[PDB]
Amino acid sequence: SAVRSHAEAVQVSRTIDWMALFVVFFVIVGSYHIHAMLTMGDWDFWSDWKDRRLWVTVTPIVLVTFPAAVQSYLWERYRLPWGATVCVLGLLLGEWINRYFNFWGWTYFPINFVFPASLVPGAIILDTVLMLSGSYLFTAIVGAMGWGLIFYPGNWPIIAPLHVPVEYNGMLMSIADIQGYNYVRTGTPEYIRMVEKGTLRTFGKDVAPVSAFFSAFMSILIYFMWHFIGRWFSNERFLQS
Amino acid sequence: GWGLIFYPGNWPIIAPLHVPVEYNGMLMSIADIQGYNYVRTGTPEYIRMVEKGTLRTFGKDVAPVSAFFSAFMSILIYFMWHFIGRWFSNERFLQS
Amino acid sequence: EAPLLDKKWLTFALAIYTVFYLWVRWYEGVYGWSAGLDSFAPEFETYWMNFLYTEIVLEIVTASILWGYLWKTRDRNLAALTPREELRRNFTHLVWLVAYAWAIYWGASYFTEQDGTWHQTIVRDTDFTPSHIIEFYLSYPIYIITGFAAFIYAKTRLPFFAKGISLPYLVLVVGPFMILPNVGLNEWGHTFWFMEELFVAPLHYGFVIFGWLALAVMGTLTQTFYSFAQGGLGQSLCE
Amino acid sequence: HGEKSQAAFMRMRTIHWYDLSWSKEKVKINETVEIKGKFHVFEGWPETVDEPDVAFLNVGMPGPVFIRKESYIGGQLVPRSVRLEIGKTYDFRVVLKARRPGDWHVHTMMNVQGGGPIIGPGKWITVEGSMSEFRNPVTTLTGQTVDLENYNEGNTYFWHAFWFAIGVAWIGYWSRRPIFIPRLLMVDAGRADELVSATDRKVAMGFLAATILIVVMAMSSANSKYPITIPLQAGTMRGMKPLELPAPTVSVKVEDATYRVPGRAMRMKLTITNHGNSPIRLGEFYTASVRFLDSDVYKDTTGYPEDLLAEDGLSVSDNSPLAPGETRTVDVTASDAAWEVYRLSDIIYDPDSRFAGLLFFFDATGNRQVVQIDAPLIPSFM
Amino acid sequence: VPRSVRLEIGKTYDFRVVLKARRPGDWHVHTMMNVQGGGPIIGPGKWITVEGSMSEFRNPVTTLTGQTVDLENYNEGNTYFWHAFWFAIGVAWIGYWSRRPIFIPRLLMVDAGRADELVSATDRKVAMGFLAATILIVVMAMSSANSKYPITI
Amino acid sequence: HGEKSQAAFMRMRTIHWYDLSWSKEKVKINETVEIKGKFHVFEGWPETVDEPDVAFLNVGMPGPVFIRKESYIGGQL
Ligand SMILES: CCCCCCC/C=C/CCCCCCCC(=O)OC[C@H](COP(=O)(O)OCCN)OC(=O)CCCCCCCCCCCCCCC
Ligand SMILES: CCCCCCC/C=C/CCCCCCCC(=O)OC[C@H](COP(=O)(O)OCCN)OC(=O)CCCCCCCCCCCCCCC
Ligand SMILES: CCCCCCC/C=C/CCCCCCCC(=O)OC[C@H](COP(=O)(O)OCCN)OC(=O)CCCCCCCCCCCCCCC
Ligand SMILES: CCCCCCC/C=C\CCCCCCCC(=O)OC[C@H](COP(=O)(O)OCCN)OC(=O)CCCCCCCCCCCCCCC
Ligand SMILES: CCCCCCC/C=C\CCCCCCCC(=O)OC[C@H](COP(=O)(O)OCCN)OC(=O)CCCCCCCCCCCCCCC
Ligand SMILES: CCCCCCC/C=C\CCCCCCCC(=O)OC[C@H](COP(=O)(O)OCCN)OC(=O)CCCCCCCCCCCCCCC
Ligand SMILES: CCCCCCC/C=C\CCCCCCCC(=O)OC[C@H](COP(=O)(O)OCCN)OC(=O)CCCCCCCCCCCCCCC
Ligand SMILES: CCCCCCC/C=C\CCCCCCCC(=O)OC[C@H](COP(=O)(O)OCCN)OC(=O)CCCCCCCCCCCCCCC
Ligand SMILES: CCCCCCC/C=C\CCCCCCCC(=O)OC[C@H](COP(=O)(O)OCCN)OC(=O)CCCCCCCCCCCCCCC
Ligand SMILES: CCCCCCC/C=C\CCCCCCCC(=O)OC[C@H](COP(=O)(O)OCCN)OC(=O)CCCCCCCCCCCCCCC
Ligand SMILES: CCCCCCC/C=C\CCCCCCCC(=O)OC[C@H](COP(=O)(O)OCCN)OC(=O)CCCCCCCCCCCCCCC
Ligand SMILES: CCCCCCC/C=C\CCCCCCCC(=O)OC[C@H](COP(=O)(O)OCCN)OC(=O)CCCCCCCCCCCCCCC
Ligand SMILES: CCCCCCC/C=C\CCCCCCCC(=O)OC[C@H](COP(=O)(O)OCCN)OC(=O)CCCCCCCCCCCCCCC
Ligand SMILES: [Cu+2]
Ligand SMILES: [Cu+2]
Ligand SMILES: [Cu+2]
Ligand SMILES: [Cu+2]
Ligand SMILES: [Cu+2]
């Protein structure tokens, strides 16, 4: 036999558990980080890109992709409810490593100007909803609604001190706006930032809630599609050519 | 290979057509003069999708970059059209 | 009666990548400012183009030698593989997967966002920026080599993977490899299509798409676990 | 850095930066340097570059080695993107504050949406001191003075660490048990319902409720701490005041313009008519950040980057006082290694061999007229 | 104006066009402004008669390299030669395999599981030679074209 | 109705309507009311509003309680 005793089998299984956790975690880090940055990283890099319309709308929709697939695999095959949490934690770890060692360690951009957005509450909501309900349709709908809606309230304690108005050289500016102005991004001019500028159809203080609800609806859709995407990605098929 | 060999294979043909000419005070290509002289009534000059230079165009890398991009997209299109042809090769019979 | 898991090999697999990439980061910090800013200068030549040529040659040589050695020493007769030796080979393949995951993290996550930083702080001048040299032409080939080696080892040593070509393994291994040709699109994206240094531009969606193929790892993992369990470990563990 | 690789004709035909000044060449940490000058938008704007309807005045440097304290276009602060008109000249001023020590090549640039970067002449500036001495004080409308280098850093660290710790605890609660193989076998065997207990359900409910309640309380506390907040200020600022400059009493027609392809020079036949302003003389030809000067007529005293300054790179067949009214046809020769160093000789690879530049005419009293010339450039190979 | 130009609304422009007769006959000639995103704007047409033979038409052009060429027949033979050469190579590649039974026996052999018998070592060597010769010929032709015309724009 | 909810700066920075007159305050059915005035286009037009290359002069009311008999901009229908 491969193993000589039950205790040896348990120890071998624990070693395999640790090694497979390492493999899954860091492959997820690589893939999720590349997808997340090349989908929404301009808003995540700079504090003056963290607006109420585009950041709040875009970030959860594109970030709900990997958690859906990883949940569809882990909960179905192992009853492990931490897929969304592990995806968010890996993305945050990679982003923070890059910000501290490259954004600040190399180009000396201040950390308070280059910090990532908080994402743990949405992953926790998704994971808990999936674990308690046990059905992927209800998880999709309700958990994606929560994931979309909790993104901006979760990040508000961080960005709130950066929105104190300042009279800078005769013009009204935000602290994040002054941060973007002072610290020169040679490759990132001011016109590139996709932030809300006001529309003639913009109503009475409804920008952030409308963006959050739109993000939640699109998160429902993207979760529903990426659940089946991950189901396909979990196939155990062998080819002969 | 299919993407990369396209332009080197055609260069011996179009190379004599790229000799510079001072046509009426303006620098022109032989192919450009051919297009100018022989009037295409239904094909004005602004329609031609040719490179005109960009502020992000770098130091003599236009053709290799185009070739490599074409090769990558050729990989993708070959992969998709292989299965397209596999579907087109089905021997199925319908009853209605 | 060697131990089932070779701790020395796992330690080497982690440490070689860690040390090499730390030295690469030190080199980027030291020479990325004095020589990497201007591309039409001699110091840029001798400090980055030589690096690119050497890394390309070494990557080709290493990939050829490693893949040929793995394919040459394949187990011709796998029917006589004892369950204990099969478990040891499974542990070695898991070490290979650990190395592949570490290389994937170093390539797709660290240096890609470092490249984003570099492009947001300076004006792009050439396709062979020091950031591009380190990211596209050093880390990506390294993780491609590691993935190909892991796939070849699994196919040539594990009876579970020797009965055919594993589709999830093939997708997980070749999918990220397609990130390397897609760099051409990236160049065609920056020189012709998009005039702005926007990291969310569609010209980068190619990367994204092939990054999705890394998700195939989950399927591969399942197969790996079965390769770990079909030898009698699962029966003893279920007791 | 980054201009030598840009197409020569694109550099010649976009924006021209004329008289520029730098307040200091060597600065200490926290000291300010002022870069002023004029920029002219070329009338024959290239078609592949969008019109500068949305343009941003930027500083080209390898990072935040300086901080841009302020920027003015026509005397008006421009923290946002602006709108520029084709064929108009604008004053610009940029005040920067030194942050990091070292020698830095600083350029003034105009980023144009749908066009890309337009880099101007770069100057080497030395910063002496320690980066730890740099301070960025800002006074808010609420009466608080803060330092932007470290403001809100601890709060961000605390919140990110808190949420990361919560996620790690959630994972580690399940990580105390067998993870992958036994659970997979149990699920395959049909014993999945045994893998989650009532205590696990209660823990998940507590985690969800605590997460929601903590988010709500944190938002309320942040609102209480900062009751006055404004959204990010953005938009394109129109109505930039251009310069009202004296029209050139000097008329210049370009008969022919040629460059030898091996070549480190450019030659042009010019017909010049003086419409008054006393006998005049050509003193300088500006092409792409490169200034070819005629030492006998004009001498630079502004510390113009020497790599871009050819003190005797202008050779005019006859540069004698052009009596008001005289129409002289002269052969001008602009020669300098900068032509090859700044890759202006790479116009041979350009899909448009046409050049544009500025000519500067000086009278006996020193009054200067600026004439704008554009023509096709013909390479010579024989 | 050999290229597209920019016109302003409400302005008047002089225009001149010099044409050279090429083919005999009566031709209705119009001056037109093609506008991008608009279409054709045709002006008054005039009937012009061309007398002579088309064989007498010449289009001399002097290049910056010191060569005078006729655009009617310039580079025609080179294009014919290269296209015929590559077409002949493709035809030879097809005809090498076309000397054997093509469709039915090969289909039956593949269905029967004897596909490996349809390609021999000599066929593999021929394919390798074809690939190597194609690549080498392309490279040599590019080098020769560059040597013949060292000045191109 | 509908202006109070529009952004204050957008209302301040688009079009200015100066001296206006209404011919009548109370009208009978089939009677006509004339509204004349001047409107100035602000030079600093907001960037999120497209330039008025295509603009329509409209009457804001809860429906066809009136019918717009005619409209003139600069004396031209
Ligand atoms: C991530 C993108 C997904 C790609 C699409 C999924 C693969 C294709 C599936 C259907 C056809 C093959 C059969 C089932 C799969 C697995 C597979 O390819 O198995 C081998 C089969 C032959 O096996 P069989 O026993 O004769 O019967 C068919 C198996 N169901 O090959 C084929 O059928 C043809 C070749 C397979 C396709 C190429 C490999 C796909 C991997 C991705 C390529 C790289 C592109 C991404 C780079 C960024
Ligand atoms: C080139 C475009 C491809 C079109 C899609 C492929 C055809 C459809 C396949 C699935 C449904 C039919 C069953 C399998 C096919 C072949 C087919 O149509 O068989 C007859 C079946 C009935 O047969 P059965 O024994 O009862 O069981 C189903 C057979 N698999 O009809 C149908 O199922 C419905 C009608 C078939 C569809 C119409 C004809 C399609 C030809 C193209 C139409 C023209 C459009 C192109 C013009 C430019
Ligand atoms: C075997 C170790 C465990 C396995 C995991 C790897 C952990 C290793 C960390 C290395 C720490 C030393 C870094 C200092 C380099 C030490 C180093 O290389 O210093 C020189 C450069 C600076 O050189 P220069 O540019 O010429 O200087 C002018 C401007 N500074 O700094 C750096 O490189 C420091 C910043 C970057 C350091 C990398 C971050 C650490 C890597 C973490 C990997 C993620 C692992 C995840 C595990 C949870
Ligand atoms: C559902 C369980 C019951 C708990 C209460 C539910 C949410 C709260 C209040 C309900 C009353 C509705 C009025 C809202 C308070 C209304 C409210 O507080 O509105 C605040 C602002 C308005 O700001 P203002 O003008 O300065 O204020 C004066 C308003 N006359 O509007 C918004 O935030 C806009 C609403 C947010 C956008 C969502 C609209 C809903 C779209 C439908 C899909 C979402 C629903 C999910 C379906 C399952
Ligand atoms: C729709 C389902 C009902 C339950 C959720 C309640 C619905 C209403 C709002 C929640 C969306 C996020 C807040 C933005 C709204 C839209 C909204 O009200 O926006 C105004 C401000 C943002 O304004 P600003 O200009 O950026 O200035 C900052 C001032 N705070 O947010 C709020 O006032 C926050 C409102 C509520 C915050 C608590 C969130 C908790 C509820 C969401 C999670 C639900 C998940 C349930 C799990 C099963
Ligand atoms: C944004 C919209 C949501 C995303 C779309 C996906 C959501 C869920 C379902 C829709 C499509 C996937 C369902 C799986 C196919 C459906 C599926 O699961 O398998 C179909 C078969 C399986 O292969 P087989 O065993 O050889 O064939 C015999 C049938 N079992 O695929 C094939 O035959 C080949 C085609 C499979 C291609 C599916 C790839 C999934 C897409 C990955 C790309 C990334 C995601 C893109 C969306 C952004
Ligand atoms: C692979 C086997 C080894 C054989 C050599 C491989 C190809 C040749 C050289 C390798 C050294 C790299 C530097 C190139 C010479 C570098 C070289 O010759 O560049 C010429 C021009 C530059 O022209 P210039 O500025 O006037 O010249 C001065 C440059 N400082 O650039 C180009 O042509 C751009 C490069 C072509 C675009 C492809 C980039 C690669 C993208 C990655 C995907 C493709 C790779 C496939 C993956 C499998
Ligand atoms: C990438 C895989 C490695 C093998 C191929 C080598 C990679 C580099 C270049 C090849 C791409 C085409 C040439 C344009 C590059 C990009 C490149 O170098 O472009 C510059 C000129 C074109 O410049 P221009 O402004 O139009 O002026 C004409 C001057 N020649 O092309 C070249 O210098 C040609 C370079 C190489 C030509 C030989 C092609 C043979 C290799 C491709 C086939 C590979 C297939 C292998 C079969 C398995
Ligand atoms: C540009 C992107 C690449 C092109 C896409 C194709 C590449 C390869 C695979 C993707 C889709 C085709 C795979 C075949 C379906 C997958 C396939 O091969 O058959 C599915 C079944 C076969 O018919 P059946 O026997 O009746 O059904 C029972 C299962 N055998 O189709 C259906 O049921 C009907 C749908 C089939 C439609 C496929 C048509 C193929 C597309 C032709 C359009 C032209 C190409 C467009 C792309 C530009
Ligand atoms: C000094 C640090 C610790 C020891 C170093 C060895 C590695 C660490 C731990 C495990 C082994 C410890 C004891 C080993 C003693 C001896 C020793 O060095 O063993 C390792 C391999 C032997 O591999 P093995 O026969 O499979 O058996 C290993 C099990 N003991 O040595 C070799 O000489 C290498 C084997 C031949 C394959 C060479 C690969 C191709 C090399 C070219 C470059 C490849 C590409 C480069 C990157 C681009
Ligand atoms: C298969 C892969 C497809 C891509 C999916 C992943 C996301 C990638 C890119 C788009 C993310 C948005 C951020 C921009 C980065 C991708 C990017 O670079 O976008 C640039 C534009 C702004 O510049 P531009 O001059 O407009 O250029 C157009 C090029 N897309 O951003 C935008 O988002 C605006 C473009 C229009 C697209 C709007 C976003 C989509 C709105 C929702 C509908 C789509 C369906 C949603 C699911 C229900
Ligand atoms: C970064 C900071 C880290 C925070 C760490 C939080 C601790 C997390 C988890 C504790 C796990 C204990 C599980 C015990 C069940 C262990 C368990 O199941 O014990 C049997 C009890 C029997 O209880 P009983 O009395 O017979 O019935 C209930 C009424 N008496 O069953 C249960 O259902 C017990 C449920 C207890 C669950 C406690 C978990 C709550 C954790 C919330 C944490 C809040 C976050 C921090 C706030 C700042
Ligand atoms: C438009 C111009 C048309 C060009 C026509 C080119 C001719 C094409 C094909 C010839 C087929 C002969 C096959 C003989 C195998 C017939 C064959 O297989 O014979 C058995 C030999 C035995 O040879 P051996 O000595 O025992 O072993 C090798 C070393 N001695 O096996 C082989 O493997 C022989 C391989 C010979 C293959 C020759 C084909 C090369 C064709 C290249 C053409 C170049 C293009 C033209 C350049 C301008
Ligand atoms: Cu890119
Ligand atoms: Cu510079
Ligand atoms: Cu000008
Ligand atoms: Cu009203
Ligand atoms: Cu007004």
CB of B92 shorter than 6 A to ligand 2: yes
With contact defined as beta carbons under 8 Å apart, do A36 and C112 qualify?
A: no
Touching, E vs C (3+ Cβ pairs under 8 A): no
Numbered ranges of CATH 2.60.40.1580 in chain D: 247-382
**Per-residue tokens: C72:** 């040459």
Taking CA atoms, A218 is separated from A144, A145, A221, in Å, by 9, 9, 5
In this structure, the number of other CB atoms found within 10 A of the CB of residue E45 comes to 12
Q: What is the A150 CA–ligand 5 centroid distance (Å)?
A: 7
The DSSP symbol for D233 reads P
Which residues lie with the beta carbon below 6 Å from any ligand 12 atom?
A: D 162, 165-166, 169, 199, 202-203, 206, 210
In our burial notation (b when 16+ CB lie closer than 10 A, e otherwise), range B14-46 reads bbbbebbbbbeebbbbbebbbbbeeeeeeebbe
**Per-residue tokens: C198:** 């926007």
Contacting residues of D for C233, CB less than 8 Å apart: 181
* H/E segment holding residue D96: strand D89-98
With contact defined as beta carbons under 8 Å apart, do A34 and C109 qualify?
A: yes
With contact defined as beta carbons under 8 Å apart, do D164 and A120 qualify?
A: yes
Cα E38 versus chain centre, distance: 30
**Largest Cα–Cα separation, chain A:** 81
In this structure, the number of other CB atoms found within 10 A of the CB of residue A217 comes to 15
| R_g (Cα) of chain A, nearest Å | 21
Task: Please list, in sequence order, all residues whose beta carbon lies within 8 angstroms of the beta carbon of residue C79, skipping any fewer than 6 positions away.
Answer: none
Q: What is the B80 CA–ligand 6 centroid distance (Å)?
A: 14
With contact defined as beta carbons under 8 Å apart, do C143 and D19 qualify?
A: no
Phi, psi (5° rounding) for residue C47? Answer: -110, -15
Cα three-residue angle D193-D194-D197, rounded to 5 degrees: 95
In this structure, the number of other CB atoms found within 10 A of the CB of residue B75 comes to 15
Range D1-135+233-246 classified under CATH 2.60.120.570: yes
Taking CA atoms, C84 is separated from B2, C5, C233, C235, E97, in Å, by 48, 11, 10, 14, 52
Contact call for F46 and D235, based on CB within 8 A: yes
Which candidate, A176, A125, A177, A183, places its Cα nearest to that of A150?
Answer: A125
Contact call for F46 and A198, based on CB within 8 A: yes
D275 belongs to an annotated ligand binding site: no
With contact defined as beta carbons under 8 Å apart, do C200 and A38 qualify?
A: yes
- Sequence length of chain C is 239
Which of the following CATH numbers is that of domain D136-232: 3.30.1950.10, 2.30.40.10, 3.30.70.120, 1.10.287.710? 1.10.287.710
Which candidate, D176, D178, D169, places its Cα nearest to that of D204?
Answer: D169
**Residue in the block written with tokens 């910000």:** A99
Phi, psi (5° rounding) for residue A172? Answer: -75, 130
Which among A51, A52, A182 is the nearest to D136, CB-wise?
A182
Cα D83 versus chain centre, distance: 15
Q: Which residues of F touch A (CB under 8 A)?
A: 4-7, 9-10, 14, 46-49
Taking CA atoms, A157 is separated from A148, D367, E8, E101, in Å, by 17, 61, 54, 78
* H/E segment holding residue D127: strand D116-128
Which among C39, C195, C222 is the nearest to D114, CB-wise?
C195
Contacting residues of E for B41, CB less than 8 Å apart: 32
Q: Classify the phi-psi angles of A112: left when phi > 0, otherwise alpha if psi is within -120 to 50, otherwise beta.
A: alpha
Give A47 to chain F, closest Cα distance, Å: 22
F31 belongs to an annotated ligand binding site: no
With contact defined as beta carbons under 8 Å apart, do C123 and A187 qualify?
A: yes
Which candidate, A237, A229, A232, A175, places its Cα nearest to that of A65?
Answer: A229
Q: Give the ligand at the shortest distance from the Cα of C16.
A: 3
Rounded to whole angstroms, the Cα distance separating B74 from B10 reads 18
Q: What is the E141 CA–ligand 14 centroid distance (Å)?
A: 35
Which candidate, D191, D185, A235, A70, places its Cα nearest to that of C223?
Answer: A235
CA closest to D380 among chain E residues = E64
Which residues lie with the beta carbon below 6 Å from any ligand 9 atom?
A: B 77, 80-81, 83-84, 87
Q: Say how many Å lie between the first and final Cα of chain A, rounded.
A: 33
Q: Classify the phi-psi angles of B42: left when phi > 0, otherwise alpha if psi is within -120 to 50, otherwise beta.
A: alpha
Contacting residues of C for D115, CB less than 8 Å apart: 195
DSSP symbols for D192-212: GGGGS-HHHHHHHHHHHHHHH
Range D247-382 classified under CATH 2.60.40.1580: yes
Tell me which chains share at least 3 CB pairs under 8 Å with chain E.
B, D
**Residue in the block written with tokens 């998940």:** D204
**Residue in the block written with tokens 């360690």:** A105
Rounded to whole angstroms, the Cα distance separating B28 from E153 reads 9
CATH of domain E59-153: 1.10.287.710
Is F31 an interface residue toward D (CB < 8 Å)?
no
Phi, psi (5° rounding) for residue C35? Answer: -120, -25
Rounded to whole angstroms, the Cα distance separating D266 from E35 reads 36
**Per-residue tokens: D34:** 């002022």
Rounded to whole angstroms, the Cα distance separating E70 from C207 reads 50
With contact defined as beta carbons under 8 Å apart, do D5 and C39 qualify?
A: yes
Q: HSE (CB half, 13 Å, CA atoms) of B17?
A: 19
Q: Say how many Å lie between the first and final Cα of chain C, rounded.
A: 25
E25-35/E39-50 β-pairing: antiparallel
Rounded to whole angstroms, the Cα distance separating C212 from A35 reads 8
Give B14 to chain E, closest Cα distance, Å: 8
Contact call for A166 and D141, based on CB within 8 A: yes
Phi, psi (5° rounding) for residue D273? Answer: -115, 125
**Per-residue tokens: E151:** 């000045």
Contacting residues of C for A59, CB less than 8 Å apart: none
**Which residues are D103's β-sheet partners?**
D126
Nearest-CA residue for ligand 11 atom 1 is C209
Touching, B vs C (3+ Cβ pairs under 8 A): yes
**Per-residue tokens: D297:** 């007529």
Which candidate, A192, B46, A45, F46, places its Cα nearest to that of D116?
Answer: A192
With contact defined as beta carbons under 8 Å apart, do F44 and D238 qualify?
A: yes
**Which residues are E29's β-sheet partners?**
E46
Task: Please list, in sequence order, all residues whose beta carbon lies within 8 angstroms of the beta carbon of residue B26, skipping any fewer than 6 positions away.
Answer: D376, E2
CB of C212 shorter than 6 A to ligand 6: yes
| R_g (Cα) of chain E, nearest Å | 28
Cα B88 versus chain centre, distance: 28
Rounded to whole angstroms, the Cα distance separating C118 from D63 reads 9
Which candidate, A132, A151, A152, A129, places its Cα nearest to that of A68?
Answer: A129
Taking CA atoms, D12 is separated from D43, D92, D312, in Å, by 12, 20, 21
Query: What's the count of helices (H) and strands (E) in chain F, helices before strands?
Result: 1, 4
Which residues lie with the beta carbon below 6 Å from any ligand 10 atom?
A: C 6, 8-9, 12, 58-59, 62, 65-66, 69, 145
